[PDB]
Amino acid sequence: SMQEEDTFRELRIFLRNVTHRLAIDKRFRVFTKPVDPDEVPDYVTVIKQPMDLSSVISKIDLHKYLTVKDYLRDIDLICSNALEYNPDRDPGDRLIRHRACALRDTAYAIIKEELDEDFEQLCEEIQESR
Ligand SMILES: CC[C@H](C)[C@H](NC(C)=O)C(=O)NCC#CBr
Ligand SMILES: [Cl-]
Predict the structure, then answer these.
(1) Is the CB of residue 96 below 6 angstroms from any atom belonging to ligand 1?
(2) How far apart, in Å, do the first and last CA atoms of the chain sit?
(3) Maximum CA extent, the chain
(4) Using CA atoms, how far apart are residues 86 and 84, in angstroms rounded to an integer?
(5) Which of 32, 33, 85, 94 has most ligand 1 atoms within 8 Å of CB, for mutation?
(6) Residue nearest ligand 1's atom 4 by CA
(7) Between vectors from CA 86 to CA 31 and to CA 15, what angle results, nearest 5°?
(8) CA of 96 to the centre of ligand 2 (A)
(9) Nearest alpha-carbon partner for 68 in 3, 1, 126
(10) Which of 19, 27, 44, 120 is deepest in the core (most CB within 10 A)?
(11) What is the CA radius of gyration of the chain?
(12) Residue nearest to atom 16 of ligand 1 (CA)
């Protein structure tokens, strides 16, 4: 229905706004673009599901997210990819892990404050109905 398409449009507007707020944060600059194989050719071999905020914006616009839970699965991948690829005790790896966890925690905190639970439940019920 048009009412359902309106619902998903509102979801996309909400997700673009959350994703913009993460992308303009200076801590999260490393997560705004895909890893360049040039610098990191072993990346694509270790990390099977690369994810970054530019890929998230592309997916919103392709209507790949029908619920905030599907979006958060991709935010969680940005974090878990960084924890897996950069596990060492040296400061460069610890800084990327801290920034990755901070990205994830910031996205969850914005959604806890600003997502209406009944809106998410409506999205889930339309998605399950398809
Ligand atoms: C691509 C692997 C790399 C070792 C790591 N990045 C990620 C996303 O894991 C990192 O240390 N980034 C440095 C910079 C910049 Br912009
Ligand atoms: Cl830096």
Answers:
(1) yes
(2) 12
(3) 53
(4) 6
(5) 85
(6) 86
(7) 25
(8) 9
(9) 126
(10) 19
(11) 16
(12) 30
Which of 29, 32, 96, 97, when mutated, tests ligand 1's pocket best, judged by the most ligand atoms within 8 Å of its CB?
Answer: 96
Q: Which domains does the chain have, with CATH numbers?
A: 1-130 (1.20.920.10)
Distance of CA 121 to the CA centre of its chain: 20
* Spatial contact of 96 and 48, defined as CB atoms under 8 Å apart: no
> Å resolution of this model?
1.5
Which residue bears the tokens 């309106």?
6
Residue 33 Cα: closest atom of ligand 1:
16
